Amino acid sequence: MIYFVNKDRIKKGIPLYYDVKEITYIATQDGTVYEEDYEIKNNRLYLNEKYENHTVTLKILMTLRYVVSDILKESRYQYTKFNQPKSKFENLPQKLLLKREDVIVLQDPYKVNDGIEEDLEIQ
Amino acid sequence: SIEKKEEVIAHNEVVFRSLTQGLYVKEVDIYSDVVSYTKDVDEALAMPNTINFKNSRKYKKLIMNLDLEPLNKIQKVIYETHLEGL
Amino acid sequence: SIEKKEEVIAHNEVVFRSLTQGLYVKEVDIYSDVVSYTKDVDEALAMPNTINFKNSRLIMNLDLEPLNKIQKVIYETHLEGL
Amino acid sequence: AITSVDSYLLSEIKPRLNTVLENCYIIDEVLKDFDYQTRESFKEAFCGKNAQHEVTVGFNFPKFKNNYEAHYLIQLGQGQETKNSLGSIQSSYFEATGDTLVESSTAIREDDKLVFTVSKPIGELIKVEDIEFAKYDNLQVEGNKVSFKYQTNEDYENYNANIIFTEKKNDSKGLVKGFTVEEQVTVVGLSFNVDVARCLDAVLKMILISMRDSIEEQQTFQLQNLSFGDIAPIIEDGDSMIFGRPTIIKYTSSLDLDYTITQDINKLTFKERKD
Amino acid sequence: AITSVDSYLLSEIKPRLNTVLENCYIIDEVLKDFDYQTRESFKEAFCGKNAQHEVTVGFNFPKFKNNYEAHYLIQLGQGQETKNSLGSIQSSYFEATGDTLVESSTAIREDDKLVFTVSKPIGELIKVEDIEFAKYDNLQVEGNKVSFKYQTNEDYENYNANIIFTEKKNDSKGLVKGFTVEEQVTVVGLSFNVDVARCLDAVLKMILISMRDSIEEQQTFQLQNLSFGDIAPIIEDGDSMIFGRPTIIKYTSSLDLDYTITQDINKLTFKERKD
């Protein structure tokens, strides 16, 4: 993606079309840019005053996302009876036709974290 | 009592001068050798020198000529606000 | 150095300012008494700075601190050598 | 003077649109007829100095991704020739003239004259604001500056005037050859939210109304006509549709070229004949 | 005053449609020409205060499912510019004015005058119902209230009048710049039962007829024209078809903007000259 900077966007912060996980490469007319000159907060980008009327471009990595645009071969069924006290009904897997999120982008959902440390020693 | 000040760049382009003749180039041939001259800065073979146009190729032969003196012609407009009391 | 220069005065006006709050006047009422203030220096209410206007109506309030505002805009060029 | 309608449209739209969206009073005036909900939502999203969301404008077929929350899209459209003059002659000029400029300039005192300074020389003076110089004032233009008699006007030594004038390019003279062209240019607002598109179209209409007082289209792009299309889904292949209402703007401009003349008569050879 | 025809249509349609469907007498008057069967079925389904089934109205492309038993569907359609004035000038105003309001107001006694109170201040008084004030009554408006002489009118101390007036916004003055626009808006009724669609179209026609007495379109949206399409299957991919008959409504409105003026003359400087 590419954005054009002006005296107003420098202070507000550039609103990004995509979400952000990490940045691969930044550049402008004066060359590349280092970590000391730019920062990102709440999925918008800030720059120092050196690039008031410069252009900026970014190669960016973002999480894969999908939405369900149709449900296909939607229900498959089995009266499972073998090795059961009584007949039981089980819904077999649905097939989904998924669609990517480009025109409108929302941030990753706010999952509730667990306090269990990952890769925890036990004794 | 300069309350506030601002600067603006209108044009920023390169212009070449002959060291001995004191003239400014205006025209070149197919080989890019000088054909004409002027003694007027306002009429010269201007090379754009804004941010986008740096590192040109049209005038490499012209640049290497030792008889020519590049000049960075820059035009500015500066706004100054004065508060002079009552 | 400078090759050519010229100076012109784009505007010359009188700005009104409060003595206590320090904010300039923005909007006014029918009699031109103040109803709004602003922190901006340029957007503030102002009038032409000439004697005829002054004689043709300070008049609104006792906060008697007008400010003669003069705008200088300068055109110049340089020939910086290598 | 060849006319690039698209560039003029962009240059007029960008600062004017930014200024209109800067303040809330103008937006409320514009959106008087709309309902409370859409009006307030648009004001929250885009209006105000500290607005987080922002609109954009650009030409069609950009190789980069373009923001589809709210954008003004321009494309050039058709054109036609409508009227001509004899020999394609439009006007005759003695001095080469460029664009028409408007400059503010405070009065200054000179030993015999009050004067106004200007940025660039003068080819012709059209108007000085709120002034009708008489013979006594003996209005004279001498390159950069215009001047009038000091004594009887001495009350106005610092008159905060402004000037409408024309640039001077050369002393040569020539003919203007060209014709009139009737051009159509298409403008459409894009948004995945239809209400935002409606409000954007209304803002576009207002700025088109405001533009009619501009110098350039008063002098160059007269006879503005408008036409609106239907709200249609621009794209259906995305996760959500793009909605936009194209608008067609018409203008009339004079494509012309200056043909110089080198013939200048300065002597006469009146002699008789004998037989 | 930018015009949003769709919102005005919705606001006029919803309460008026509800009121029309409220009572049976009006519906019977409307459906006089229709047969007994369809008339009575529609009356049973939708008509009456205690009707279980209900109609709805909304704009096009709703992301949610929309009821297809009986619904009014609106879409914006095309637009065109038809007429202009010199300099795009429409009108001149000395005092900023908003919408035109109609308010009922019972007469009141004041020590010298009978008066009517109003909700908001007055910019201009158009009409007082069944009154033609003479010079003796000395009609005067003083902000919120309008007044006339007490003594000779004392029989009318409690006159149950109503007032058509205009809001007051500011004391500033300016010019109205704009043009006229000829706009088309499409309205279609949807129903899987064709007879319901026919009756719905008839009701739509009647409410369009009734709207012509409305203040707003009397003042803003003159020259109403109608055009009806053919009954067509809107959708065939469902278990049963959707049937609807689109109708096109035309209006003429004046898109305009108020351009304020800060120039006010209050003094004169008539002086002679000497030589």
Per residue, the 3-state secondary structure of A4-39, as one string, reads ECCCCHHHHCEECCCCCCEEEEEEECCEECCCCCEE
Spell C4-35 as b/e; 16+ CB within 10 A means b: eeeebbbbbbbbbbeeeeeebbbeeeeebebe
Contact indicator for B16, B64 with CB cutoff of 8 Å: no
Measured over the CA atoms of residue E154, residue E160, residue E166 and residue E171, the dihedral's sign is positive
Structure tokens at D119: 């940025």
Closest-CA residue to D1 (of D260, D254, D259): D254
**Facing B80 at nearest CB: one of C65, C72, C78:** C72
Which residue of D18, D64, D238 is in closest CB contact with A1?
A: D64
**CA separation for the pair D132, D137 (Å, rounded):** 10
Q: Is E35 helix (H, G, I), strand (E, B) or coil?
A: coil
- CB distance E259 to E173 below 8 Å: no
Are the C-beta atoms of residues B55 and B72 closer than 8 Å to each other? no
Q: Give the resolution to one decimal, in Å.
A: 4.2
The per-residue DSSP string of D74-90 comes to: EE---EEEEE--GGGEE
Question: Tokens 């229709």 belong to which residue?
Answer: E34
- Establish if B52 touches chain A: CB-CB under 8 angstroms: yes
Strands A88-92, A31-32: pairing is unpaired
- Specify the amino acid at residue E73: L
Is D108:D146 a contact under the CB 8 Å cutoff?
no
Provide CB contacts within 8 A for E88, sequence distance 6+.
D209, D212, E177, E178, E179
CB atoms within 10 A of CB A34: 8
Contact B52 A29 (CB under 8 A): yes
User: How far apart, in whole angstroms, are the C-alpha atoms of residue D56 and residue D71?
Assistant: 5
Calpha distance E13→E55 (Å, rounded): 12
Cα–Cα dist E205/E198, whole Å = 11
Token reading at A63: 């999480």
Read off the amino acid at residue E271: K
| CA E72 – CA E76 distance, rounded (Å) | 13
* Contact call for D50 and A12, based on CB within 8 A: yes
Nearest to D212 among E76, E88, E183 (CB): E88
**Residues D74 and D186: beta-carbon distance below 8 Å:** yes
CA D125, CA E179: separation in Å to the nearest integer? 32
The DSSP H or E segment spanning E42 is helix E36-46
In sequence order, what are the residues at sequence separation of 6 or more whose Cβ sits closer than 8 angstroms to the Cβ of residue D159? C48, C50, D106, D107, D114
Asked if B83 and C68 come within 8 Å (Cβ–Cβ), the reply is yes
Burial class (CB in 10 A: 0-12, 13-18, 19+), E181: buried
- Name the H helices within E140-275: 194-211, 215-219
Rounded Cα gap, residues D114 and D126, in angstroms: 18
Chains that contact C by 3+ CB pairs under 8 Å? B, D
Which chain A residues touch B54 with a CB distance below 8 Å? 29
Q: Give the β-pairing of E56-59 and E71-75.
A: parallel
Measured from the Cβ of residue E11, the count of other Cβ atoms closer than 10 Å reads 13
Burial of E21 (0-12, 13-18, 19+ CB in 10 A): buried
- Chains E+A touching (3+ CB pairs under 8 Å): no
Report the C-alpha gap between E227 and E246 in whole angstroms: 9
Structure tokens at E237: 């991919």
Which phi and psi angles does D17 have, rounded to 5°? -65, -45
Q: Which amino acid is at D11?
A: S
Task: Give me the residue from D206, D227, D229 closest to E257, CB to CB.
Answer: D206
- Asked whether D140 and D147 are in contact (CB, 8 A), the reply is yes
Q: CB of B8 within 8 Å of any CB in chain A?
A: no
Residues of chain E contacting residue D206, judged by C-beta atoms under 8 Å apart? 2, 257
Residue D151 contacts residue D193 (beta carbons within 8 Å)? no
Cα A77 to Cα A82, A88, A96, E116: the distances in Å are 15, 11, 17, 76
Strands D71-75 and D56-59: parallel
Burial class of residue C59 (count of CB atoms within 10 Å of its CB; 0-12, 13-18, 19+): exposed
Spatial distance between the Cα atoms of E265 and D199, rounded to a whole number of angstroms? 38
- Among D80, D76, D79, CA closest to D186: D76
Chain C contact set for B41 (CB, 8 A): 3, 79
Interface mutation target, options D42, D205, D251, chain E, most CBs of E under 10 Å: D205
Question: Nearest CA to CA, how far is A18 from chain D (Å)?
Answer: 10
Q: Distance between CA D198 and CA E77 in Å, rounded?
A: 12
Residue type, E172: S
Q: Looking at this protein, which amino acid is placed at residue B69?
A: E
Closest CA to C10 of C38, C48, C40, C62: C48
Question: What count of other Cβ atoms lies within 10 Å of the Cβ of residue D187?
Answer: 22
Nearest Cα to Cα of residue D251 among D176, D186, D177: D186
**CA E205, E207, E209 angle in degrees (round to 5)?**
70
